[PDB]
Amino acid sequence: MSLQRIVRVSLEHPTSAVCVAGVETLVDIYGSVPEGTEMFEVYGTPGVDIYISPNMERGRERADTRRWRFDATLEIIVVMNSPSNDLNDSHVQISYHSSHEPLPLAYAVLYLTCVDISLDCDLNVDKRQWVWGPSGYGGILLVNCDRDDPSCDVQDNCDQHVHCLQDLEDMSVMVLRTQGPAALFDDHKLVLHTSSYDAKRAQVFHICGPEDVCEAYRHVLGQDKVSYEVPRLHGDEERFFVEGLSFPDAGFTGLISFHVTLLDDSASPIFTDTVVFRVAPWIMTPSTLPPLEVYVCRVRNNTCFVDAVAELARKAGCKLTICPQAENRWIQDEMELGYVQAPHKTLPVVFDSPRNGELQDFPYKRILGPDFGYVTREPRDSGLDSFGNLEVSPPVVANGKEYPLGRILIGGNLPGRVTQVVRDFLHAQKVQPPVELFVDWLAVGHVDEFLSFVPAPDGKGFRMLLASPGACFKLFQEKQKCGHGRALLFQGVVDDEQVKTISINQVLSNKDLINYNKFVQSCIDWNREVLKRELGLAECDIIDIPQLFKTERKKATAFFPDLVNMLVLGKHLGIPKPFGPIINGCCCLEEKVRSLLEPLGLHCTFIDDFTPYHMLHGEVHCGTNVCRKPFSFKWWNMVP
Amino acid sequence: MSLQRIVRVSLEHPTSAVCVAGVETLVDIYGSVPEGTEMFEVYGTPGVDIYISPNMERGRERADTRRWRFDATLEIIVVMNSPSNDLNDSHVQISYHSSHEPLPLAYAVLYLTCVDISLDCDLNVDKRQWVWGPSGYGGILLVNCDRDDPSCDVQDNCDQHVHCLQDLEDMSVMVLRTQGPAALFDDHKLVLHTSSYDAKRAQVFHICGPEDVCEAYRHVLGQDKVSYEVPRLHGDEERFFVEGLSFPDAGFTGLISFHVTLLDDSASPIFTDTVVFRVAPWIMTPSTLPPLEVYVCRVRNNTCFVDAVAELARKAGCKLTICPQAENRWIQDEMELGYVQAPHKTLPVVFDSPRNGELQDFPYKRILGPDFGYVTREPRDSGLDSFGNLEVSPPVVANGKEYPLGRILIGGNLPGRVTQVVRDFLHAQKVQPPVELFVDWLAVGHVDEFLSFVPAPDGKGFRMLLASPGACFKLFQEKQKCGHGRALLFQGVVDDEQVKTISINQVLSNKDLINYNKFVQSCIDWNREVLKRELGLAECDIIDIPQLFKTERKKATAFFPDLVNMLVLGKHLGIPKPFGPIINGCCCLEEKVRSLLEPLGLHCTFIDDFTPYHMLHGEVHCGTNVCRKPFSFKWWNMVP
Ligand SMILES: *CC(=N)NCCC[C@H](NC(=O)c1ccccc1)C(N)=O
Ligand SMILES: *CC(=N)NCCC[C@H](NC(=O)c1ccccc1)C(N)=O
Ligand SMILES: [Ca+2]
Ligand SMILES: [Ca+2]
Ligand SMILES: [Ca+2]
Ligand SMILES: [Ca+2]
Ligand SMILES: [Ca+2]
Ligand SMILES: [Ca+2]
Ligand SMILES: [Ca+2]
Ligand SMILES: [Ca+2]
Ligand SMILES: [Ca+2]
Ligand SMILES: [Ca+2]
Ligand SMILES: [Cl-]
Ligand SMILES: [Cl-]
Ligand SMILES: [Cl-]
Ligand SMILES: [Cl-]
Ligand SMILES: [Cl-]
Ligand SMILES: [Cl-]
Numbered sequence A, B: 001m002s003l004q005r006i007v008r009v010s011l012e013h014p015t016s017a018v019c020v021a022g023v024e025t026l027v028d029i030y031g032s033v034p035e036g037t038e039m040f041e042v043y044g045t046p047g048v049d050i051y052i053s054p055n056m057e058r059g060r061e062r063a064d065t066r067r068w069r070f071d072a073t074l075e076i077i078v079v080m081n082s083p084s085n086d087l088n089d090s091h092v093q094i095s096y097h098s099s100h101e102p103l104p105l106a107y108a109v110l111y112l113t114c115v116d117i118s119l120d121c122d123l124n125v126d127k128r129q130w131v132w133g134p135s136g137y138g139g140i141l142l143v144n145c146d147r148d149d150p151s152c153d154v155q156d157n158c159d160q161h162v163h164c165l166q167d168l169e170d171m172s173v174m175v176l177r178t179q180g181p182a183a184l185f186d187d188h189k190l191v192l193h194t195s196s197y198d199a200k201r202a203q204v205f206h207i208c209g210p211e212d213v214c215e216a217y218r219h220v221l222g223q224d225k226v227s228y229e230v231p232r233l234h235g236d237e238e239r240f241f242v243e244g245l246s247f248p249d250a251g252f253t254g255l256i257s258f259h260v261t262l263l264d265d266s267a268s269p270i271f272t273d274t275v276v277f278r279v280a281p282w283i284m285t286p287s288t289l290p291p292l293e294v295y296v297c298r299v300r301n302n303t304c305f306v307d308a309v310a311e312l313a314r315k316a317g318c319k320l321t322i323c324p325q326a327e328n329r330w331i332q333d334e335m336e337l338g339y340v341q342a343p344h345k346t347l348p349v350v351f352d353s354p355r356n357g358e359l360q361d362f363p364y365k366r367i368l369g370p371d372f373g374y375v376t377r378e379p380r381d382s383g384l385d386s387f388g389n390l391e392v393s394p395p396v397v398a399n400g401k402e403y404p405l406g407r408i409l410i411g412g413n414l415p416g417r418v419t420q421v422v423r424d425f426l427h428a429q430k431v432q433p434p435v436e437l438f439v440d441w442l443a444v445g446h447v448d449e450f451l452s453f454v455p456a457p458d459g460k461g462f463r464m465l466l467a468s469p470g471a472c473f474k475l476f477q478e479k480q481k482c483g484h485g486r487a488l489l490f491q492g493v494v495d496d497e498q499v500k501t502i503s504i505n506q507v508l509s510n511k512d513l514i515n516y517n518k519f520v521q522s523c524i525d526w527n528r529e530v531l532k533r534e535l536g537l538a539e540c541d542i543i544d545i546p547q548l549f550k551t552e553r554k555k556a557t558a559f560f561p562d563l564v565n566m567l568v569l570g571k572h573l574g575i576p577k578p579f580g581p582i583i584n585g586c587c588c589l590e591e592k593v594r595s596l597l598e599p600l601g602l603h604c605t606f607i608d609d610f611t612p613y614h615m616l617h618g619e620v621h622c623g624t625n626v627c628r629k630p631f632s633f634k635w636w637n638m639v640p
């Protein structure tokens, strides 16, 4: 199951074959044996393993211990597991014998120069193929999309040099052992190389001075450099550092091959070794994971929303990053905070939306720190649904398959959508197979407007919450059956243009509003069945949250503040204050929200956001982004 | 495991839902039930199946036989397995009851209009995915690369019409059943469609008059036509005929999807059905299969070679197609005769080489008959190895995997080849994973110059024959040991420029020739080990044929006529007459060839081809092509 070579010898002159350590070499002869050959012996220098074996069966046996009856169906295998100290310091001798004369009929001498050449980085086996699963192997290469060097205002993938002392942590090591006699390399070339396609996807740096000098990490393989001649500057081992340049995309499967080759120019190759890296994909974090940093804007009239986000994220231990002006508020539409995982350094990565104009400068300026990669996709042609539309589910099981990193959720329409480049990126990450949903019926049309996952220690670890006009129907009808129909919804709120205060009786007896909410619930029910199919969830995990919808056209906006589309930080969730019907001094919508959520251990704190948001078609989740702790499950044993 | 719909009803007004036959519909309500609801009954029109089931377990039970205690965790499923005869001719009625008053509290009525819509072609299940293996399913679509219509000088894929009466045999049927009430279609649209990418890869024709009129096969889906409105011209069933336009290539995985959709414009879709075709790949035929037609040229000085090919192919029952002038001889370099298989009509297909100049007109003019497809690949940039370099192995087992259609064999060099477009085509056929070999050392450099498979009822059904200078070494040395060293090789042959007659002693004692043949055998041994690894063959299946090699440069031509590179037609093989050393009135090389081949039942007939060929670097196989009977093993259950 190893490399096989056939080196033939001649009874006229000895041969000077060069072999590679560990590789087997079949030994045969040009022409025929002596005329009266009946037996043969074979002998080898210490450190030269000689085995005899029939060509039919595959059982090996030491060959230098007896005089073998001659048989053309036998074959001799020579293996040198250790490199030679000097050229041709070992040899094999085959003598042919007959019972007629006592002396050997003929000799066949083969001198051997053994060289130990191997290229290895981190062999997680064939070493030339990448296989998925817990029993899989292969090296992982990152993309290095961050800024570790403070001198640069640009990305770390752009420089052909390495002018940072800790940027090397983002790269992958690759050791080339080249043990053997030095004079051999006066006759043979050592060439590292890679295909031009892979060369345009990653860069390799040789080392000329260990661990101290930035100029010593000499760039040897890049966009135009497809091959390089390793001078063996350190002796029997050369260290290389490879950094990826791109993420898996529509045309890039995600595998790059690096080869080393020994050439005989005084060129003809006699040995080649390969190493295959897989570019680690971009992984999204659903709301079920523990949060790390909460992001929120501060706009010309954002006064108490920031304070509420602060005093409510301090219960989950978050960093509370704040933006001074946002050039305007929608911090959840411009960026999505995922990560890329490696067995040495897993770093979080921001994905920048092509929905630009307000926060278009925030990610590439003040979000890619030392360990914070940056990736973005802009189409050549336009985005209307963007990263409010992009969410991720918890780990699920559906269609027989298991999704331990969840599935991606984006919206669209069935008969005709998010731009094709973003779709291609998400589908090419291959680790969270996306599920395209129906969101085109909403005004802005983002998935997070009707769907939100929440952690709950029961059932499946989480609950999927869906907005449901029928839930509000049931709640308002059951409250009417008590006599509180004259309770008003928008009663307690700072009214500037005096949004008209509607009552329960007015809402329930408004035919157009009720029919429009029935249509909205039919859309949400279609999405609900698609979610149950593609995520394998039951009604035990699905909770309906009461929510009505306004409209000024054929598309849907929220009637009162959207209860779903909330900020979910582990045990604490910030929900938009619905300003519902006050029945006993407390909002009945808030009472229903508590009755639905707090039995799951969560604590619901409602934020007044009627003036800052919900009048520009957004809620707290629309104004708050968050990055989360990566999954414990590693992405390589995923068997897609 | 079917499509799931949720249709909600209201206690205020009945609903008029339209459902699809076989599809389940969950029935719920907007808002809450009556105030004192304790029980409920459900009733359905004959032909309406109503089941009750808890939302946790998945056991169904008929629901219209008792009065059920009310439970919000129960759900009712409505299924109509048969289409309706008139609009809303069936209905479901849900009554809510209490033990307090004897009459029902409220009713909920849902009228149903059932329509049976289904698109099916040949469902070999999900019907939207193509899976490999004996337990796999999916439809097969051909490419229709032949000329069934005599009126056209061009291919059958080029016309947008169908002006042939038997070209339809090459297409694939696709039936769309649309049973239901006719008035429904006054309100709903029926749309067939496909993605523009798939639209550029295949064409679809609707039918407007059965089996008689060519103009009735109306083109509905093509390069620009991505959607079409089916008028239901025949009633409850429409027939479509789809023909493929391309083979699987680097950018085309080989799958095309056709969808049908029911729209509600008085548009909103409520049902969509899909059908996925796989384009059948191009399959090559190795020499082990029985032959059908032998092809050979007739050139200005080809006198007895054609006669020998004729009188030697008449033993295997071949058609013996002859070319009058070939515009010059290399009929094996211009074309490769494979086939494309379908469950209805498997047709042979020629693959035209980009090596043009001599026979560039033969395939597209006089080889694509009624059932003879044509495919070709020309690069935008040049071919130097072409279709002498392209061969195919018998079914093998290697690397654990099983190759029941064999593997493709093409030549090249390791450190740097056949053009990339041909490589991409062969690799994209996906059914015979190619093995790139080392052939760059030869003058013309074709795989068939040193490798040939032959049928033999023993071992594995076949024997791989490799040219070996060492075999000729052994033969000439064993003949020297008798005293026939003064026997001459090129003795009996028509000598015009008097090729010098060499003897065995002169050949064996020529140091340059012997060393060059040793290098040649080392190359062939590298290829031999690669073949043993990639085909899983042992020495029991490998036979070495004696062959020496000339040279006027650093590349290799044949010394005497190449014994391998022969015409293999089942039990009969035409071998080039080697004109070897005559020892007892018979050529000793022919005696060795017989001793190696005839014990396998084969019969060796040698053809004088020294003047026609072997002086322009070719042998009988270089001047003879052949198509063979397709494999009995079908390509769809191949599990690549
Ligand atoms: C949850 C979420 N991401 N919501 C997005 C906020 C909607 C926003 N709409 C506006 O800014 C707007 C307000 C008033 C008039 C016109 C537009 C958007 N375009 O995404
Ligand atoms: C087995 C096979 N396909 N052989 C190919 C024939 C070689 C041919 N060479 C010539 O025609 C030639 C003759 C004399 C001088 C220069 C070229 C070819 N080019 O393929
Ligand atoms: Ca750098
Ligand atoms: Ca870095
Ligand atoms: Ca942006
Ligand atoms: Ca770093
Ligand atoms: Ca998002
Ligand atoms: Ca046609
Ligand atoms: Ca045809
Ligand atoms: Ca051609
Ligand atoms: Ca036909
Ligand atoms: Ca061929
Ligand atoms: Cl050798
Ligand atoms: Cl893709
Ligand atoms: Cl509901
Ligand atoms: Cl308030
Ligand atoms: Cl409905
Ligand atoms: Cl390909």
Ligand SMILES: [Cl-]
Binding pocket: B468, B470, B471, B544
């Ligand atoms: Cl041999």
Ligand SMILES: [Cl-]
Binding pocket: B492, B493, B608
């Ligand atoms: Cl003769």
